[PDB]
Design an enzyme around this catalytic site. Structure first.
Site, mmCIF file in Angstrom:
data_model
loop_
_atom_site.group_PDB
_atom_site.id
_atom_site.type_symbol
_atom_site.label_atom_id
_atom_site.label_comp_id
_atom_site.label_asym_id
_atom_site.label_seq_id
_atom_site.Cartn_x
_atom_site.Cartn_y
_atom_site.Cartn_z
ATOM 1 C CD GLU A 219 -2.723 -1.296 2.463
ATOM 2 O OE1 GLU A 219 -3.619 -0.469 2.207
ATOM 3 O OE2 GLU A 219 -2.768 -2.056 3.454
ATOM 4 N NE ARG A 221 3.922 7.575 -1.868
ATOM 5 C CZ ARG A 221 4.995 8.197 -1.374
ATOM 6 N NH1 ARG A 221 6.128 8.290 -2.070
ATOM 7 N NH2 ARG A 221 4.942 8.730 -0.160
ATOM 8 C CB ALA A 272 2.426 4.605 11.227
ATOM 9 C CB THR A 280 17.770 9.326 10.014
ATOM 10 O OG1 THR A 280 17.272 9.790 8.755
ATOM 11 C CG2 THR A 280 16.739 9.620 11.101
ATOM 12 C CE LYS A 281 23.500 14.019 13.866
ATOM 13 N NZ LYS A 281 23.712 15.399 14.395
ATOM 14 N NE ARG A 309 9.655 12.023 15.656
ATOM 15 C CZ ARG A 309 10.135 11.903 14.415
ATOM 16 N NH1 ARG A 309 9.588 11.066 13.536
ATOM 17 N NH2 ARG A 309 11.180 12.637 14.046
#
Lengths: 320, 320, 319
Positions: A219, A221, A272, A280-281, A309
């Site tokens: 779903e 890319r 998500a 990216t740290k 996150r």
């Protein structure tokens, strides 16, 4: 020699005889020397990678030559002999950068029939060989001819529906591979490899030279060159980067709208909405105590990682 | 006077004689008074903004009046005389709030033909002049008549396909401007301006009265009223806001799934995932030392900005 | 007993007499016993949930049995009498788990015709009854048969366009409910409920057994089982996901936001904010801090404003 590939195609040409597209019903990878020896004299093939236009009469001859050798191809040739559209025999001695539009189409067909996998074939310089074309309900139409044909349809109370204006047609207008669902076929390009057991949902997208081992639920890319391992679900709206070869491993999970710009190893989970680039740290966590703050590039290919996150301080974390 | 525009259109009417849509092959912005004085008496045009239906005979006569003045419009009108569908002449004294569906359609063509830019034409009150219509493979269809044509189609083993139900048809069913790619044309409304050198990918969407100067790579959502300057690339699933006029300057980069609720000046970068509205408190930085905490609205239209999210503490930052 | 549903369908069969799809023009919920009383014996219905294939002859008799009873249905069957396709009468005694494709299709039509709402109808086990089919301009096509027909079109300079390969067709090829706008109809499955006053834009998606009370602006993704209350707008690329995830009345959901909890009435959610049951949120009052809770405990609560603090990345809920 042993030919790389051959396929008998029916295609479309514009008013100056430029090929816009070719439909190959039954492309062959590593065709037997018997088939090639049977067909080469009729076509005028000697060597190399050639796109050879052939007449209806030659179609009848080729169909006879291959009765006894390959019935599937013979049967194709008998149909092709009655075509109202130009025919082309694409015989490739070798897998090299494509030199014609017909060849370009053949290689995208090898991918979508699943006869070869992403990265397996040379596609360098494909872009200039694939003309920008209006894809319409009556077929490929040249951009310099379209305006007239649109008006003409309107005069009859009809519509010439133009559903894409691009260098790549949608895959399913050429081939629907077995064991596959594609909710909205505008989102799967010719040249995409849709592995057995893959469902591409409406927000899913798969470019050429990319796709899925299968099974899986796509779903998101999948960009050019990106391959996805078996049993890996891509959430709605997520993305892979379109440099090292980006891929997604086996068993992976990718939350909605997430973005991954590095390789993911087997059994990775991604949260998500989260975006990971090479720089990216991320806070590497353990069984969750802190270890150290490294860049995502140095976790590239690692198995069983969980990217999330921290909702309270916004810190990106990787739980091993 | 100097007409603002005129165009000869072939359209579709429902059973009660309400216009559903018009197709203008060759719309004219600021036609010459030669063309108007040649056309006005045959239609009955005096003044104002009028949508004048004309007959097959009038079509011949108008072609005959314009042989020698404008041969393209002449050639067009002789084609229209042979039409199976009703004709309309739309002559506009002034660019004003639209008063007819024919006029609403014309103004959308002026944009998509690139004869005027977004904001240059008056579209106030357009929504009630654009009927809600079923767009099908046979053309536009009145919603009240649709069920009967659906059933009847099924009785023959055929399908009346319904690909949109809306006030705005897709631009490409009317016009494909030169030097443009649009992978899925369902995501570009009539009234979009798609500049020379623009590639709208599959996740790209462009509403009416909106679009690109060109060149550009639109994989995000260009909302109504939003114009995007040359060389500016919108990432996968990013968004503009559809109040100050929201725009994007030249040479901009907007990362995948980012939101921009403020105008972006020239050469601005925005990081993928970051969502900036007018009241977004940003940590303005320098040649990356701190300076202060300002609201994004105050940094609107500033050149050479770089908006990002701090991957270690979540803070939104701008690097000059 | 009282029939839960009945509809006279026209469908598409492949060569092993398998049913790919059925088109019901006028599906009836709780059909009058009068209408049923006339039609059951001509078809040979006794009881239970039955999908009875029936002939062109019967169509003439069933139009006749309903002349003087239900004029809409009589007219329907006089047309079905002239059909070039196999016809199915679908008579359901109860709302139970579907058993046939005819019945599965019908249950999707009851949803899309708005005759029942999401969750009000039993769809348990529907997946296996919906064959995977290439949806093309000429109609639904058996996958096994498709390659031949694709080739044949090309031989005539024609195209057999395959616009979907799925177990569900797009809603609009069967029905367009009144007062509805759907920009890209490939994004609304048969089985969706699109309530009056809804505009589904191009980035909007509604699955089956899901939809909108209406009116609303849906530019986001409405997943199976999800129902959106009146006056609620959903932004571009936003997503809805066990408790039944719903959106209440008058809500605002920003672009690319993700709601993984049921949202009470008049909730606002900031663009790009991703809230799930386990999301830890700084609860603010009238904006001083009160405590830190999980979003699950804020589920269903009215008048909440979810936003991400741009200075420290904290998810905040302002009451």
């Amino acid at each position: 020699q042993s030919l790389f590939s051959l396929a008998f195609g029916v295609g479309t040409q514009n008013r100056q005889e430029a090929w816009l597209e070719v439909f190959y019903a039954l492309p062959l990878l590593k065709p037997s020397s018997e088939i090639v020896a049977a067909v080469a004299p009729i076509l005028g093939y000697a060597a190399g990678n050639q796109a050879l236009t052939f007449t209806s009469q030659q179609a009848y001859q080729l169909a006879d030559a291959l009765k006894g050798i390959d019935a599937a191809q013979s049967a194709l040739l008998s149909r092709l002999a009655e075509s109202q559209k130009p025919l082309v025999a694409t015989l490739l001695a070798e897998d090299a950068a494509p030199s014609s539009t017909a060849e370009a189409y053949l290689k995208l067909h090898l991918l979508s029939h699943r006869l070869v996998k992403p990265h397996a074939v040379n596609l360098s310089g494909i872009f200039p060989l694939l003309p920008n074309v209006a894809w319409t309900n009556i077929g490929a139409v040249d951009l310099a001819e379209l305006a007239e044909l649109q008006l003409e349809a309107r005069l009859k109370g009809k519509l010439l529906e133009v559903f894409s204006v691009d260098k790549f047609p949608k895959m399913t207008d050429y081939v629907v591979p077995a064991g596959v669902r594609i909710a909205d076929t505008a989102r799967v390009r010719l040249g995409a490899y849709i592995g057995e057991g893959t469902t591409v949902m409406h927000e899913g997208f798969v470019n050429f030279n990319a796709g899925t081992e299968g099974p899986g639920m796509i779903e998101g890319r999948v960009s050019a060159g990106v391959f996805v391992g078996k049993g890996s679900d891509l959430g709605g709206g997520c993305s892979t980067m379109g440099n090292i070869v980006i891929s997604v491993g086996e068993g992976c999970l990718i939350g909605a709208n997430a973005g991954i710009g590095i390789p993911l190893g087997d059994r990775n989970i991604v949260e998500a909405g989260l975006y990971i680039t090479a720089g990216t740290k991320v806070a590497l966590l353990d069984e969750n105590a802190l270890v150290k703050v490294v860049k995502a590039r140095d976790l590239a290919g690692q198995p069983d990682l969980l990217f999330r996150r921290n909702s309270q301080n916004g810190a990106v974390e990787c739980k091993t």
